């Protein structure tokens, strides 16, 4: 048995697998902490799980590529998010007006010509 | 203790304390603790006298340091002076020697900024 | 000098490249250099034939020079006499398989660069500056085009004060991509100097 979700956020992609059992999380083999060490947004990825009562109800098989661990953790989170409608198409009620089903459509805007870094422009006295 | 003709910073780490000579930097130092095998981590104040001399001879006799080195260097240019060459004419007039631009900038080599009047 | 070239906008949007090949990094540099000889000789001569759009499709060292032109029998001569003179004068420059065709400019007012030329000619021809440009446009919504516009742009009529002129009609909408418009840059030469000319035609939204 396995329930899967599609998790994606800002040039980083994450894959989620929800089996019934414990609450151990393997993200690219490694434990949830041996991959998200002294980092605080870490334990936040699990949030979409704990607003329906099930940390200890399911296991976590994980895979990620791209981005940084935040942008992964947002995707991991968005993965456990989607993953729960494939188990309960009724959990959908609880985790949308709670906001956990959405692609953070936010994205590193393009660097523009004439502008040091897109928005930033060049300083000028003697105006 | 004292070496090269200078009393090195007591209370401080060994490795740092030897930089404080005119013959030694970061490297030539921590390699003289390699080649006299005393823990670089410890303080200059906690040695043995045994472990004092042992760095004294090696450091002093091998390299050229202190008074002798600015002396050699303040001669090695004194050399490049009377030579008539490009580089000597610079150490004299106090303009940079390493070819850097000289319109704008180039301060630390000329002194401070002596201001005039445009037109 | 504020705006943009119309053709170079619809690059594979509502137009097409003339030279349509492939190429490697080794080849593209030289290969193209060639086309700009092909199109320098081909032009320089064919002028009083009214030459328009010059395709140069390419396979394995087979060049494929098509040619759209006002007057196919001033490319030809009598019988097939003068087209041969050139068809090799190109394989004389390439060193390979010149397949130099011919394709008539059916309706001549309904293709810009021609329109541009005859006007730039008419300016070289010491004609009535305005009326040139008026009738220019005139004929274009007379042949049946959606939109017309000509831009005479020199020291005009022989004047020392450099100005510019023009007129137009119909839809001229170069901010609609999906509107096909043809640009014509000409470039008259008269005793007082040099007087570039422009011409835009709309045919239709697609």
């Amino acid at each position: 048995e396995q329930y899967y979700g599609t998790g994606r956020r800002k040039e980083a992609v994450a894959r989620v697998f929800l089996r019934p059992g414990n609450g151990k999380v393997t993200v690219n083999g490694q434990d949830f902490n041996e991959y998200f060490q002294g980092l605080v947004r870490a334990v936040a990825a699990l949030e979409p799980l704990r607003a329906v009562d099930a940390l200890g109800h399911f296991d976590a098989y994980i895979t990620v590529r791209g981005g940084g661990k935040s942008g992964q953790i947002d995707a991991i989170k968005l993965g456990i998010a989607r993953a729960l409608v494939q188990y309960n198409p009724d959990y959908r009620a609880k985790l949308k007006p709670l906001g956990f089903l959405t692609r953070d459509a936010r994205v590193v805007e393009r660097k523009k010509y004439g502008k040091h870094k897109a928005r930033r422009a060049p300083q000028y006295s003697k105006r | 203790a004292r070496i090269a003709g200078v009393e090195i910073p007591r209370n401080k780490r060994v490795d740092v304390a030897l930089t404080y000579i005119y013959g030694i930097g970061k490297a030539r130092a921590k390699e003289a603790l390699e080649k006299t095998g005393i823990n670089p981590a410890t303080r200059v104040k906690d040695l043995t006298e045994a472990e004092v001399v042992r760095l004294r001879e090696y450091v002093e006799n091998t390299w050229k340091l202190e008074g002798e080195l600015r002396a050699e260097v303040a001669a090695n240019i004194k050399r490049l002076m009377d030579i008539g060459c490009y580089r000597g004419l610079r150490h004299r007039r106090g303009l940079p020697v390493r070819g850097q631009r000289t319109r704008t900038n180039a301060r630390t080599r000329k002194g401070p900024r002596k201001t005039v009047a445009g037109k | 000098g504020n705006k943009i070239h119309p053709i170079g906008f619809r690059l594979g949007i509502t137009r097409d490249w003339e030279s349509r090949w492939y190429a490697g990094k080794k080849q593209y540099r030289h290969l193209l250099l060639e086309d700009q000889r092909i199109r320098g000789l081909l032009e320089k001569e064919l002028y009083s034939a009214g030459l328009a759009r010059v395709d140069i499709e390419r396979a394995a060292d087979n060049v494929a020079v098509t040619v759209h032109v006002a007057k196919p029998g001033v490319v030809i001569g009598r019988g097939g006499e003068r087209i041969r003179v050139l068809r090799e004068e190109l394989a004389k420059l390439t060193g390979k398989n010149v397949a130099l065709n011919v394709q008539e400019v059916q309706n001549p007012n309904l293709s810009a660069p021609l329109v541009a030329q005859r006007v730039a000619e008419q300016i070289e021809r010491r004609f009535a500056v305005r009326r040139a440009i008026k009738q220019a446009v005139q004929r274009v919504m007379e042949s049946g085009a959606k939109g017309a516009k000509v831009i005479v742009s020199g020291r005009i009529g022989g004047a020392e004060q450099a100005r510019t002129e023009w007129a137009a009609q119909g839809r001229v909408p170069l901010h609609t991509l999906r509107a096909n418009i043809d640009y014509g840059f000409a470039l008259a030469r008269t005793t007082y100097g040099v007087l570039g000319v422009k011409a835009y035609i709309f045919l239709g939204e697609v």
Partner: protein, 155 residues
């Protein structure tokens, strides 16, 4: 603005405790986005505070804020020939910034050698009534009053 007032930035409530105030502080520590630092800066100040004056570090924060939150300010302005520094009351949120703003700004002006340390002290010292935190609060209620001479030009 000039088209309407902004809605104000709806922050992520704290990951550990849960206060939205805790958030805005952590960001208001943070420099150059280096947020995994300022989170530790915060959560070591709660190890110090829970263990130097053994109560709930979280409660002291709430109080260390109420106590630097000014209530009147000098919303300066002009007539037509010279301009007057002018007493004005303060918004609900405007407090919550200047609170945390100043709490930090003091902590960096504190003399200690350590990061979460100069937060810990300037968190007790705020919720006492001393330290640079509260000094400034009572300083622009003081320039609210020792400048009350033009509370008719107030807007």
């Amino acid at each position: 603005a000039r088209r309407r007032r902004a809605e104000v930035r709806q922050l992520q409530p704290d990951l550990v405790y849960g206060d939205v105030l805790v958030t805005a502080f952590i960001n208001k520590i943070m420099r150059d986005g280096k947020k995994n630092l300022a989170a530790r800066i915060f959560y070591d100040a709660c190890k110090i505070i829970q263990e130097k004056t053994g109560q709930e570090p979280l409660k002291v924060f709430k109080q260390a804020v109420e106590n630097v939150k000014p209530r009147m300010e000098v919303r300066s302005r002009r007539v037509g020939g010279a301009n007057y520094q002018v007493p004005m009351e303060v918004s609900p949120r405007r407090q919550q910034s200047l609170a945390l703003r100043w709490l930090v700004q003091a902590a960096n002006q504190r003399p200690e050698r350590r990061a979460a340390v100069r937060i810990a002290h300037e968190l007790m010292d705020a919720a006492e009534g001393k330290g640079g935190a509260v000094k400034k609060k009572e300083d622009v209620e003081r320039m609210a009053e020792a400048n009350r001479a033009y509370a008719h030009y107030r807007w």
